[PDB]
Amino acid sequence: QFLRTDDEVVLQCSATVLKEQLKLCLAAEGFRLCFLEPTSPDLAICCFTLEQSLSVRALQEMLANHRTLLYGHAILLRHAHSRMYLSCLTTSKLAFDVGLQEDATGEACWWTMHPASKEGEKVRVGDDLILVSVSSERYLHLSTASGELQVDASFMQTLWNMNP
Template sequence: MEQVLDDIQYLRTGDHLTLIAQVKVPVERTLAAAAAVSGGGLGVHGGRLSVVGGGGIHGASANEPIMELIRVSLAADGFGTHLSHLENLSNHDVPGDIVSSTFLCENALSKKALQEQLLVDSSAQSLTNNAGSGYKTLLYGHAVCFKHVQSEKYLACMASSPSSDKLAFEIGLVENTIERAWWIIEPSNKQRSEGDKVKIGDEVILISVSSERYMHAALPVFSPLASFQPSCWAMGIVKRGDVEGTTMGYVKGGDTIRLQKGLDECLSVVEITNRSNTANSSYVIKHYDSRRLYRS
């Protein structure tokens, strides 16, 4: 029974997942336009002009920008630049590139086991192969390495710093699982503690082993950085890892599938909010060019 719960509720090595964060971005529109979009009106509260009613738009004074909460996913290109970026998932007209945002949780080690492995004078590739046998449930406080599925490279804290923050480091892709490619999983709230199992959809804080800095969704550059400011990342499942004894060629409950029409169209769900009553939302199914989800 416990093994069944591990397969359903908890993340483990071998799973394909996405890292999603929520960030605030300035909205380039007037307050009146914001009120029209959100379905609310304008009002004054404590000397601040804000949008009354609606959702997603935060009030601001005349000199402050209007902030909107959006969802972004950590992504990287399979070719060209080695740096990662943030993919906007809140654009209902253009779906986010899920392929570039998918990472394989290839290996997980305790802090002590990782330090012992790093002290051994061995190749970086053997570090993964020796310790990555079988499937292990992810635990808070353990170190993990994420392999970008499209490029088959590892997510790492780079040695270069961005021009906007000299105390931070850029995040990109490297060939091997060196120390810079390992991240510590820490809970983002007091409901989880070190040693607990990581559930699907949990919001976690990722800390670089090499720099001891947090993985942060930096704006407005739309680029993740390893900095002293943490961000909460929701670990969503894309595909479960193959389990020993599983019959291949069959669709099981919990599997991720794509409904494709013809050769270059697939089905996607878009949320349509009733502007007169934001409590009511409906969903429509649209055709999208599936080539938007892939990069050649």
């Protein structure tokens, strides 16, 4: 089974905190910066819909003016609860915060998918994914510094899983 557009998904990554394996998933509220909640958790605040998936040139064309996800394509993720969009924020080190945006205007809310180790191939459900910001060219990153499990956009890469 392959990932398709208009699919409700949860973005999940792995972490080794205190010699113990953790399964964390991306969450956000309405009133906003994103956070990571360990699985055992209210899915409503974790649900993202794959609104769009366009190639590099198609996105550049749109910016200048059932579908299957492929590697290289840029995706648009809509927070199901607040109807807002996952974007790379201007606020923060040279890393950037990741929160919610109120519109699909600009590059910030666009992320490109890249494979771990195996372009143009279909993105399978339950796969290792490299998500890259279009506006800042930074990877969606798990930071576990100072005991805070925060999500940001930096030059360090974190593998993500997208499951419906």
